[PDB]
Design a protein around this nucleic acid. Structure first.
Ligand SMILES: [Mg+2]
Ligand SMILES: [Zn+2]
Lengths: 64, 96, 237, 126, 143, 158, 38, 55, 176
RNA sequence: AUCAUUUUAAAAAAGCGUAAAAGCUUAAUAUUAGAUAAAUUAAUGUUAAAAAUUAAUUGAUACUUAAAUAAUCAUAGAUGAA
């Protein structure tokens, strides 16, 4: 019953909007990248259902 | 000199160990590295057993960048090759 | 590849989207080979007259059309544009899909049977079709399309499926009829291949086989080889 | 197939552009958008290119000068010539014909001095 | 002529001073085919010149196919007699020197089953240039 | 001058580099001193066994200058050691008979990575997948084996 | 030169030139490839 | 997502022809040291970094 | 579209003029010695740069003659206070010349006389195997330079004979 | 046999080349500038959403399938355009 919807389904489509209208996201994001050092990724889609606000891998880490 | 891999005279022979001792990515080698071609047939049946790991995708794409160049170079051959000569065939080659 | 390896190692986990997607299409197609899409197609056109000769049309880039009818039905012959005709091919579904023709308020179902092209000149001569009516038998071509199965044990290793027939001719008596046929050959083997009667037993009630076209139900489609090593060891020894 | 036996030589008619240069100085405003990238490409052709067809003392540079009016391409030739070409409006093609307008003359100056500034015929065939 | 006793009997057939026939072409066995496009006397050397070049296509080493590729139906039909040099007219009919095939307009010379589309178009063009006849190549794709 | 005239692949023993006349056919007409050349080779490869054949490249230049570069031994030769055979299959794919186990592949890949300049950017999965395709062309397979092999010294043309 | 009614290009470098009703081929490499149509 | 969050941008570009001038000195170009934010997102020569010096 | 380019030297200074009616457009070149004008149709649009002394042209009329219009216009201006130049050589055994006041004497294994006489040129010898010509028109030069060439030219077997200093030379093996 | 890796991209190569090597060019591709991407048809009345729309045509450009029309050439004899 969910077959057709999941085909076209993608969570990453939300990225271009959240990159604009969320200052809480960027300002701490600035700190993660510029100043300190980790293998940060950014918005990473959790099995096409969520997009984690900030994450680190392969350690399966989340900063929501 | 009872050396198996030792190129350096100074070093010693790295000895075997249990397979669990090594990183996981050796396990992805023993499995049959599929083409992207059979891999779709797997997805046609949704065989949960055989499915590619993540690194497989890069190698499948490099089959696919390289297969596109195989056709473009074939079509030139099929159209410009003198009838005296022979084409390579695209089927199996049963010997004996 | 398109990104350096050093960055890909950080993002090796990302590629699940790649493989999780290909689950969806190739499974969807593999199960949707059988079904006609539920979408109406229409072809505006005009009647035939004795005035409109071929070569007159063919400078105007129209085309003749021909329909063969069925029991008790009269034939119909029409005029249409070429670019309509090729667009009708250009669907997936061309072998069987139901196409209508609107002359005026009237509509005439049809199917594709074939087209003739003038081979030395390579322009469209005519576009031939076959009538379809609901309450009466109607010739259609049901292609056979075999799925892969990693559930059988002989199919997986060193054996080869052999599709001796591409499709089946039948007679349909109802509105919606199946596009094609799909088979799961697990229970098959070298010992028994599939035969047409194994299909005749499994069809809807509105369908029947056109015995006038086929030879015998005991005819067989899918055949399976033996093992290769059991040959190869014997070949060398 | 078959072996060529006629050898057509095209070495003497080879006339590259940056050959009579001694130096170069790229100038960049970060406020240009058309005059930046034009100078990017030239700096490559000064170093990415081959050193045979350049002088031995050829040194090209790049500097970010916010104070300039426009991004520039300053240049210096062998026999004394020196110029500047701003780049906020021009193209890469309008520049080359200026370079020919110098390089065509330096031959007329150096040949009179006796200098063979030409290449062997065997350098590039067709 | 008479097909009953070919080798034994002596054979004669009328030259046909204006013989024209068209036979509606259609594929039966396979996918692609070559067909003739003009009434003509098809020799044998018109075939034997480009006989190998079909084998190189349809047949290849170390590959086995169960089904059949080519279907040919050519047979000789016309004896093509002739007189000697210094012979007056009358006093009978001439003698033999060859045999041929009188083909109609739309004649399936060859019928193919899954053979390389790209080579047959390269073949039939060269075929038709030696022969100077109009020939065609057809595939179920274009139709 | 610094411009590259030519490139040559070679094969050499580590400490027995010597002006063999069967290498002057390549380096003769370029005017390179085989003696002065082989000196700088044997000097570097003193930390390597002398039985082993390596390979090297030489960017021969327009002034008959040179700049030698060293690479690991031939990847095929290394496997013939483990496999204890000298000659491999005519055919490939159809005739598959040989067997290595992964636990040496993981060790001979390090050979390539520790030395070869091309793989400095690369990971180990990458390198290990390179030889498996080289193994498909040869009649070789990767299967678990508990045992160890015994020594063998497969030939090299030198 | 050699008069070919049916002209033909042997090498890629061959090219066509038309001087009035006159037609021919020329090559920058092999001067034997050149032709005329008559 | 990195390109928006950078502050001290340092645009770079190559002037490489081929690695033969570097291989034949047993050298090469590193990117593990200072694995940077961006490499060749749109312009397939550009690199961006924070470090005002980058060797 | 091909947007042809008109070079202007540095010694030259120019102006561009139009009517109030804007139905006429023309251009004026002016030097210490000379002056020269030429118009542009309503269908030719124009762009100018003082940065390069180059002018760019589009043509809605799609006339292909403009590509020749350039070379005349370009060279006709550089023909003011600048020369064109060319150089000639030879290589051989029994070859020589002698030079006396734009009257060049050639001795290349020929029974007859081979004088070359220059009307309104410059000719100055730099070595035994080299001589430069100079003149303001390019088309008279080649007619002046090529007459020297036709006495002996490059053998296709050996590069012995005369030749220009920039040319396509042919070679063919012989007597291996 | 047609694997695999590094690459922004690069064929166990579609070809020339070599005693074998070397060396040259296409496919695939980047930087910069110039620069084509324009017109439409049919659907569930109004409520999902930091978000996502199907079937389909015509036309500009390049690759590709190819055919048709028009002009030109496709050597000419023997009393003199004929
Ligand atoms: Mg390769
Ligand atoms: Zn040519």
């Amino acid at each position: 019953a969910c077959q057709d919807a999941e085909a076209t389904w993608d969570a990453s489509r939300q990225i271009d909007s959240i990159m604009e209208n969320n200052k809480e996201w960027k300002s701490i994001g600035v700190l993660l990248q510029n100043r300190l050092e980790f293998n940060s990724i950014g918005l990473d889609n959790f099995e096409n259902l969520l997009l984690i606000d900030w994450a680190i891998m392969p350690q399966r880490v989340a900063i929501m | 000199s009872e050396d198996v891999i030792n190129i350096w005279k100074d070093r010693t022979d790295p000895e075997l160990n249990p397979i669990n001792t090594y990183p996981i990515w050796l396990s992805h080698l023993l499995l049959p590295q599929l083409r992207f071609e059979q891999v779709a047939e797997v997805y046609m049946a949704d065989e949960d057993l055989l499915k590619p790991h993540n690194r497989d995708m890069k190698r499948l794409i490099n089959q696919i960048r390289r297969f596109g160049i195989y056709e473009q170079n074939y079509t030139k051959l099929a159209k410009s090759l003198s009838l005296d000569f022979v084409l390579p065939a695209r089927q199996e080659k049963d010997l004996f | 590849t398109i990104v350096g390896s050093q960055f890909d190692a950080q993002t090796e986990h990302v590629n699940k989207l790649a493989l999780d997607l290909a689950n969806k299409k190739y499974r969807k197609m593999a199960l949707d080979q059988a079904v006609l899409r539920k979408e109406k197609v229409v072809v505006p056109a005009e009647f035939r007259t004795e005035k409109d000769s071929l070569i007159s049309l063919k400078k105007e880039l129209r085309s003749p059309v021909y329909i063969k009818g069925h029991t008790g039905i009269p034939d119909v012959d029409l005029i249409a544009d070429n670019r309509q005709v090729f667009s009708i091919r250009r669907r997936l579904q061309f072998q069987n899909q139901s196409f209508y023709f609107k002359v005026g308020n009237e509509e005439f179902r049809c199917t594709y049977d074939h087209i003739q092209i003038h081979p030395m000149e390579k322009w469209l001569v005519y576009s031939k079709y076959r009538r379809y009516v609901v309450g009466k038998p109607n010739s259609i071509f049901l292609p056979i399309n075999i799925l892969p199965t990693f559930q059988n044990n002989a199919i997986v290793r060193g054996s080869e499926i052999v599709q001796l027939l591409d499709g089946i001719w039948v007679n349909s008596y109802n509105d919606e009829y199946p596009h094609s046929i799909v088979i799961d050959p697990e229970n098959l083997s070298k010992i028994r291949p599939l035969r047409i009667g194994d299909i005749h037993n499994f069809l809807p009630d509105g369908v029947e086989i056109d015995k006038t076209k086929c030879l015998s139900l005991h005819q067989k489609v899918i055949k399976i080889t033996g093992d290769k090593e059991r040959k190869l060891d014997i070949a060398l020894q | 197939g078959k072996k060529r036996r006629v050898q057509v030589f095209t070495g003497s008619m080879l006339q590259p552009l940056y050959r009579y240069l001694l130096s170069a100085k790229i100038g960049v405003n970060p406020l240009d958008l058309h005059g930046q990238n034009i100078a990017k490409q030239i700096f490559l052709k000064c170093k990415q290119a081959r050193p045979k067809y350049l002088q031995n003392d050829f040194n090209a540079t790049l500097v970010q000068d916010n104070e300039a009016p426009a991004s520039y391409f300053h240049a210096k030739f062998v026999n004394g010539y020196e110029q500047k070409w701003y780049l906020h409006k021009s193209t890469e093609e309008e520049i080359n014909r200026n370079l020919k307008y110098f390089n065509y003359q330096i031959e007329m100056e150096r040949n009179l001095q006796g200098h063979d500034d030409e290449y062997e015929d065997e350098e590039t065939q067709l | 002529m008479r097909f009953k006793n070919l080798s034994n009997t002596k054979q004669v057939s009328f030259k046909l001073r204006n013989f024209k026939k068209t036979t509606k072409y259609r594929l039966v066995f396979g996918n692609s085919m070559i067909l003739l496009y003009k009434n003509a006397r098809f020799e044998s050397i018109y075939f034997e010149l480009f006989r190998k070049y079909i084998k190189v296509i349809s047949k290849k080493k170390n590959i086995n196919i169960n089904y059949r590729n080519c279907w040919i139906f050519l047979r000789m039909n016309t004896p093509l007699t002739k007189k000697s040099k210094n012979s007056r007219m009358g006093k009978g009919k001439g003698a033999l020197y060859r045999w041929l095939v009188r083909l109609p307009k739309h004649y399936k010379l060859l019928e193919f089953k899954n053979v390389n589309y790209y080579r047959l178009n390269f073949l039939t063009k060269k075929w038709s240039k030696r022969l100077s006849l109009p020939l065609a190549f057809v595939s179920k794709a274009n139709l | 001058m610094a411009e590259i005239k030519a490139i040559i692949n070679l094969r050499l023993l580590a400490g027995i580099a010597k002006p063999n006349p069967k290498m002057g056919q390549s380096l003769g007409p370029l005017g390179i001193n085989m003696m002065h050349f082989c000196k700088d080779f044997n000097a570097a490869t003193a930390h390597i066994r002398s039985d082993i054949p390596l390979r090297v490249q030489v960017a021969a230049k327009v002034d008959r200058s040179y700049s030698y570069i060293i690479k690991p031994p031939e990847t095929s030769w290394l496997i013939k050691k483990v496999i204890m055979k000298e000659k491999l299959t005519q055919y490939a794919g159809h005739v598959n008979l040989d067997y290595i186990d992964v636990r040496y592949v993981y060790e001979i890949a390090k050979i390539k990575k520790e030395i070869d300049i091309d793989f400095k950017r690369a990971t180990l999965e990458s390198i290990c997948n390179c030889i498996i395709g080289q193994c498909n062309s040869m009649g070789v397979n990767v299967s678990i084996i508990d045992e160890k092999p015994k020594p063998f010294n497969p030939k090299a043309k030198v | 030169m050699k008069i070919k009614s049916a002209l033909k290009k042997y090498c890629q470098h061959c090219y066509i030139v038309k001087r009035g009703k006159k037609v021919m081929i020329k090559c920058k490499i092999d001067p034997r490839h050149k032709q005329r149509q008559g | 997502i990195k390109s928006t969050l950078l502050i001290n941008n340092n645009y770079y570009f190559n002037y490489i022809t081929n690695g033969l001038d570097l291989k034949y000195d047993n050298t090469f170009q590193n990117f593990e040291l200072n694995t940077l934010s961006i490499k060749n997102y749109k312009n397939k020569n550009l690199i961006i970094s924070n470090n005002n010096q980058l060797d | 579209m091909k947007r042809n380019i008109l070079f202007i030297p540095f010694n030259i200074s120019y102006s561009y003029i139009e009517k109030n009616n804007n139905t006429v457009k023309f251009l004026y070149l002016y030097n210490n010695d000379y002056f020269f004008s030429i118009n542009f149709n309503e269908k030719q649009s124009i762009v100018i740069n003082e940065d390069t002394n180059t002018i760019v042209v589009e043509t809605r009329n799609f006339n292909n003659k403009i590509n020749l219009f350039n070379n005349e216009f370009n060279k006709f201006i550089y023909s003011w206070d600048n020369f064109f130049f060319n150089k000639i050589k030879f290589t051989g055994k029994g070859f020589k010349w002698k030079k006396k006041e734009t009257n060049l004497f050639l001795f290349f294994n020929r029974a007859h006389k081979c004088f070359f006489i220059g009307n309104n040129i410059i000719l100055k010898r730099l070595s035994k195997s080299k001589v430069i010509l100079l003149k303001n028109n390019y088309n008279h030069l080649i007619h002046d330079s090529i007459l020297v060439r036709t006495i002996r030219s490059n053998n296709i077997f050996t590069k012995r004979g005369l030749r220009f200093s920039r040319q396509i030379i042919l070679k063919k093996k012989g007597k291996t």
